[PDB]
Amino acid sequence: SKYIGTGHADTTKWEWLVNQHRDSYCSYMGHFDLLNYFAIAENESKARVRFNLMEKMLQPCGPPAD
Amino acid sequence: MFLYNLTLQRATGISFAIHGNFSGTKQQEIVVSRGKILELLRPDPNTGKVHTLLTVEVFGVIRSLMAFRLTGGTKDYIVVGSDSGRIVILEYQPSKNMFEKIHQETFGKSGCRRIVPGQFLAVDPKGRAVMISAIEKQKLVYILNRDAAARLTISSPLEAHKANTLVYHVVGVDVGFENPMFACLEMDYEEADNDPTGEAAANTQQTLTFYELDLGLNHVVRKYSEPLEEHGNFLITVPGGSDGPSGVLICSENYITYKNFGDQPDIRCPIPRRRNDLDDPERGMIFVCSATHKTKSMFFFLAQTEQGDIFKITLETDEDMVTEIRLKYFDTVPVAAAMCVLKTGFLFVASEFGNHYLYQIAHLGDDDEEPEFSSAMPLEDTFFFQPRPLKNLVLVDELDSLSPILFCQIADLANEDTPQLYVACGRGPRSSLRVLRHGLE
Amino acid sequence: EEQKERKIMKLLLKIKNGTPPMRKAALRQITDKAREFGAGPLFNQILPLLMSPTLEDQERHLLVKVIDRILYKLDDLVRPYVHKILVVIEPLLIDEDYYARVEGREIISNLAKAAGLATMISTMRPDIDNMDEYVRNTTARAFAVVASALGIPSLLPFLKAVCKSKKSWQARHTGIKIVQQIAILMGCAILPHLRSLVEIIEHGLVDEQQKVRTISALAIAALAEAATPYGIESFDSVLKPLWKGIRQHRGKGLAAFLKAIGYLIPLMDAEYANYYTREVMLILIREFQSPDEEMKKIVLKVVKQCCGTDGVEANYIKTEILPPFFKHFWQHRMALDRRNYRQLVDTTVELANKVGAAEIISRIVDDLKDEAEQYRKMVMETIEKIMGNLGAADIDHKLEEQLIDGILYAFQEQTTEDSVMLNGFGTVVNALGKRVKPYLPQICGTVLWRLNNKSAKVRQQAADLISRTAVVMKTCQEEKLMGHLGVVLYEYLGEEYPEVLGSILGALKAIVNVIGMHKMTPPIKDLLPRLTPILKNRHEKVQENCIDLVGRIADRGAEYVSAREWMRICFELLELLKAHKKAIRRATVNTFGYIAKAIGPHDVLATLLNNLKVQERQNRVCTTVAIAIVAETCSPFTVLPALMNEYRVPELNVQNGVLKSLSFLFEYIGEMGKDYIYAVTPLLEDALMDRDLVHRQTASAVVQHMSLGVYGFGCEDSLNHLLNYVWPNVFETSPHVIQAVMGALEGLRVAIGPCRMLQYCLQGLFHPARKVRDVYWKIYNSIYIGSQDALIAHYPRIYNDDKNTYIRYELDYIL
Amino acid sequence: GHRVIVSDVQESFIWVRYKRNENQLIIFADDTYPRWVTTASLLDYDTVAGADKFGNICVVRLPPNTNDEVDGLLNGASQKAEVIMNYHVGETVLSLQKTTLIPGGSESLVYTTLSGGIGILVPFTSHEDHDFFQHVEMHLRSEHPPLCGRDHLSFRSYYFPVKNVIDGDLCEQFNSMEPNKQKNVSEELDRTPPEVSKKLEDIRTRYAF
Amino acid sequence: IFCRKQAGVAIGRLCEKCDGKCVICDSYVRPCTLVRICDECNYGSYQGRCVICGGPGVSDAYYCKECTIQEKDRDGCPKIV
Amino acid sequence: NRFTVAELKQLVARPDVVEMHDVTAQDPKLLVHLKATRNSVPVPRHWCFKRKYLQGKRGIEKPPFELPDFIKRTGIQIDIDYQKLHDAFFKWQTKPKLTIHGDLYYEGKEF
RNA sequence: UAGUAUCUGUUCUUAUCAGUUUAAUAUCUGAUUCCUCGAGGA
RNA sequence: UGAAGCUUUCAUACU
Ligand SMILES: CO[C@@]1(C)C[C@@](C)(O)[C@H](O)[C@@H](/C=C\C(C)=C\C[C@H]2O[C@@H](C)[C@H](NC(=O)/C=C\[C@@H](C)OC(C)=O)C[C@@H]2C)O1
Ligand SMILES: [Zn+2]
């Protein structure tokens, strides 16, 4: 429960999906050749891709329900 | 089926680069990081050739690399943070030509994780403390000391955790043998997860937080925290103590800001643009790397934009206060991942893709007619400059690099008997098709 | 109301005799409460409780933390009480307890940070000029703590002012003592302020008062000791006065100046170090003849410090330093002097480490024969230290003869059994090696005489010597009277003292562990039957050595003993596997392996199965361990058929025993099991299909041990097959069964990979029933905590809805 | 000649047959793992070598007999393919090709990486060489651990556990250890350091330079 | 029942009673990695004491090979409270 | 305010994985979507059974676990041959009928 | 020593809805002179 | 064809 990203019987789809999006972005920031792949694919500098991922970290999957 | 793996040609792409006196003598060396390879290089100040001294496979993912030196020592150490849950400190042994592991400290599980530190690594400029940080709430601080045999001792970590917090960059602050300080670009996302309207996601600002380590009381405390005007990328340590003020440079979108705690106001300078630019007008401009050069008389910075333009940044100061930031166009080189300014007047450029470059800094000082921009200049509207061929730098050496390889075909397209390797590599207008042959030239 | 706040701040009793949760709760609440309570009542009550005569250590620690927290909040309101607090806590800084000193320094540091520098100075200044020497020491230590807390440049002006005071010499003395205590307390952190402190204190070396000169020299020595191996251009205005003073002073002040010189010399270059050494060396040679047994210690320390530098070379040392050193310090008066004895030994060893072992070793080796045994032990200690640090490359025929004769005469002339002569004899013989051929007859005669009689405390020392020297004893092709010694050691097998029996067994084992059975003259057939009743002895050393000896005999001389006795010995060793000393268990495992390798797996395995069928729990567990040992020494291809044939017996608690044995077998053999997973798979299927809870629990344990045993060996097919039978048990309520199932799942997470586990969890993660969701999220959290990084490549694709984006687009890029 | 191999962006491999007389494309086999395939190479009529965005190489081989003639069990195809090899490289591979590099040498699998690296995977031909190199790797995993604190077996098992690959970049670090540890390692393999060095050089010069 | 606060340099110890069996999975086969404990569990009179029964420590505490394989050595101070 | 089985069967791409209780979940659309992933074996099917797991029938009598062909050829039931036991175990080794990852075992599946 | 399992015994209107809860049941909570042979049942 | 659950005063076995 103290670890961030764990769930329980009341976990919703939104929390699950934002958790996997957030640690996906962190894994992209960590691995050197995944960021290379993305920066070649979208034709940007690697610093720009890193900053874009950090900016996307705040609200991935949009704002929550109700 | 059982397979044996062999490497024929190692990786040649550079991720991080540090410089220092790693052999203990007066000459300077560079330590570069590949993805999973560590490498020591030494550029010759007589011919300008870059020679490789040592290269080791580490079997991990290097994520942060720093150099530090204790007071009174003549040798630099290497701090590595990786995808393991350990911080490692290394020492180069010139007589054995190998890296000797000095210290190992375990703090968490392995892998590139959200909340396990290893992505960010900062060190105190005097060398008495090191901070390892994750992208999320966890931060750790180690105190570095020395015994009577002049060997390095490490302490147990101090925690500085803070939930629901994202970190963009951490740097150590240069104080005058006062308590060590660390600066962080932070963002709190707790409010954004509770608002279904989506308005707490916006209206959320970065903060510049300062962490003070009290060596007398042995704990880390949050001293200052201020909200910023817009979201910024990496930070730059300003040299302090008895040579310079003690603050930070925040690089941001279209701006660069100087900041210090106390009675110092904020100073902003907009980044100049190229006159008659052909790029989409909706796009902004950020800095991608930086390089500091300290001299016993003065200091300056070298920052590069995404277009590959290096500007020379100086700081107009008072007894203690900073009054202006001045920017001047320096040169245009390929977009680099790291830049190292070496004593004896050499600039090393490690590009994100393609060949790397070593330049001779030919023109010291600045006796020129080109305009110098300032933060004191009024503008309703942005500064403009004209890019030109190299004037301050001379190309001395070029290191080949096959990164990134995108397509390969092994075939005998000439009428030799040995096949050749035809490699489509490179990105943008620096791409090329390379033919590789086994042999010497 | 006044006692209102008192009755409510009995929170400190809430904490003192209280539980940890309410400890921290009351801590936080009293921290919030402090600013309103006021420092007056709070301190008025806490300082008595901290002054309590019988308070504990950790109660004191918690009180100090309370002080820290209530001091951080109320910052500038503590001023009118500072003086009072100090009179309570200016002691605890000269206390003989280290942690009391740490706590007092922490309290004073937090007090100085709460208050200001001016307040501390104004309350501490009146006691600067006091006449009671007990106050001037705590005052200096507290000023040092304040300088360490608030910084050195903040106190530099007050220091510069106080040690220029022309009013009294006590103020100057106390200021210089403050600088000295600052150095002592802060260490190598004074280096940026070294020159400032040195120019502040330097004018005291030429004062008209003799106490000021002494304290200035002591402060210079403290700074130089804190600065080492740096700091020398800051010690420049002191070189002239210090050396002129050692040239003119005489006595206590001379000793202080010489200590300063000695701490300053190792900071120089070769020139200055070489030039300065000459001057202080003529002075020190003159002072070799002075009286106080403090002066000798200081002189020895300075000699050791200076003779360890590069500017001083071995030629000058042997020409000028060694004759007077060895003429004045090496007399038994030094030996009965317990204070400087260790200092003399260390100084002599560190001298030999530069000048060469031969000269020192000769000059003291002629003295190994002496009427006093204190002087003998001293020389022996020094000699063996030099020998261990250098070895003995330069021993000559003459020196070898003298060494051997001396150590032999010293061995016999021994009143009480000491480890000194034993270790000396051992290391001397071990360093000589194959060179001591005739002194081997001599040493054998000596150890024969010592081992023959005299109380078994000499006999056990002789046995230790044999055990540590038998290698070089046989190393020269001399065993024969080696056998003469083994015969006597054999006759010394009935001993009432177990300590001597342990050494006897060790010596016998060391002999036979290098003496071939062919030529081990006591026939193996006779020895062993004499040896088997000793296995029932209850001493640990006797047991371990006996088991090791029987193991060696079974490993090499298996041919002589008729079997049956080996079977009896192994069945007796079976009970030693439960021994509560790791050593005994380790030796028993080794010996059982040797006996099994010797007599063959068939008969011992039949006996072990019979024994597993009929006995109580602990003996059956030991039998299981023994079966695993037999199967590891003799390949499991010899054990598995007979063990699987026993599962065909129709009885309950019989199959469960087979399953427990298989569990421990796989756990014990680990990597060797990669060739035997296909053979036990149908049995595990049957047991996993078995209604009995133990059958499924034990089968899960087997699966876990097998999974963690084979990892990286390509056994994923059978493990996936077995997971197909383990998984349906996740809906089990029995705690032991579900515990074993979780263990097996976490073993399969390593052996099979996290991708398969996520594939098994996906459809249940979001089931409508809460039971399924609880179970699956427990399994998923266990899979997620280990290998969080690998799961990145395994997550399934989830499509975007109208509100939120869920596709990971970067992984869809195609170069 | 007969079959078609399809790479999915997130699924690994689909086997298809073209019915020449019926004019039909029928799926007859697939895999049981999600793979972000970057490139693929055919090794023979039944086996495929694949690469991944996350830096892994894998080999998949079809089971014996099969059908060939077709007219789901996991929401997929009825028949499945087995994974016979798994290896983490550490860099993203974008090219795989089976070829012979030296004149008069043996065929190897050459791969190419996004960081500019080039490497090969070569098959063993005898059990003795395989066992010797396995023991070398085992003993070098313990007495010469990675420099930055990583576990070697755990690094090559980053996303999937290793299967049937020996890391020859760890094995060639034997030639750069100190003589004392080289002797401690060599005396367990019942051999001297020069013999181990010669055996290491033999397999390299058999295939590559 | 486990302390589990991030540790440091203090080396965990075991008493004579259980010397050589894991602290996590209490096992009798193959030790691997040295045990580190938090500073609070080694502070003051607690230094060198057994990580299971707070009694006198005579040997270094170890995690078994199976625990280090499963990275159960990275979960924090295993001193039993 | 909850779907019916036929109503939810009309919304999903794969209606044959929908079951009785699937309309009673907190998020049935995600549940049915995960039930259709191209992998991911289902739940052990006895969660709703009140007879717990296994047991149920003690009628069937099972003979002692039959030894493998080669081991039963070794003639274990006096001169014993070791080389025959070794060579036979390794050289005569055979692979038993393994099962696929998807396949699961139930109480009545052994008959 | 005190925990589990297996036999034996018991096991709650073929009368209707609502609420808590449950996957759904289950559980719990509330409402809805006549016949037969001095008696029983509805 | 089938669905054997729940409880205790039972009684009997294993830890
Ligand atoms: C009664 O005290 C307890 C229960 C608690 C304790 C920790 O305080 C005490 O120290 C501890 C010590 C004695 C016992 C019985 C515990 C550990 C030992 O037990 C023994 C009974 C096993 N026997 C075996 O290991 C089987 C085989 C042998 C030879 O080993 C090996 C490695 O093959 C396992 C273990 C070695 O037991
Ligand atoms: Zn602890």
Ligand SMILES: [Zn+2]
């Ligand atoms: Zn204990």
Ligand SMILES: [Zn+2]
């Ligand atoms: Zn363990």
